[PDB]
Amino acid sequence: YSNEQEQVLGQIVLANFANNEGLASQGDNVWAATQASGVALLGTAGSGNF
Amino acid sequence: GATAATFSLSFLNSMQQNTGANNIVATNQNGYKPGDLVSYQINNDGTVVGN
Numbered sequence: 255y256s257n258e259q260e261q262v263l264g265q266i267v268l269a270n271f272a273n274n275e276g277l278a279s280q281g282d283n284v285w286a287a288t289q290a291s292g293v294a295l296l297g298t299a300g301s302g303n304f
Numbered sequence: 305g306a307t308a309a310t311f312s313l314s315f316l317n318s319m320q321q322n323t324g325a326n327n328i329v330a331t332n333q334n335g336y337k338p339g340d341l342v343s344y345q346i347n348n349d350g351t352v353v354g355n
Binding site: 302 | 327
């Protein structure tokens with residue numbers, strides 16, 4: 255901002271899967287979660303396994 | 305107007321160790337919202353499963 259003060263608006267979450275090859279592509283470079291891919295493990299960049 | 309659901313919350317397998325930071329591993333529950341059928345399939349073992 256103009257008052258020499260910064261405000262955080264959000265943090266982009268990232269998702270990693272048990273089986274990347276199990277994802278089902280939905281077109282326009284978009285994937286969807288499926289049983290084969292397993293449930294999405296969420297996290298932040300630079301920490302854990304991201 | 306919906307009556308609250310009474311449920312048992314389990315913290316099993318939780319550990320307190322010298323991690324880089326506190327990390328939440330898994331959260332799960334057996335409830336779900338109303339939904340209509342969007343797909344159906346027959347699995348390789350004969351089961352009919354509706355998504």
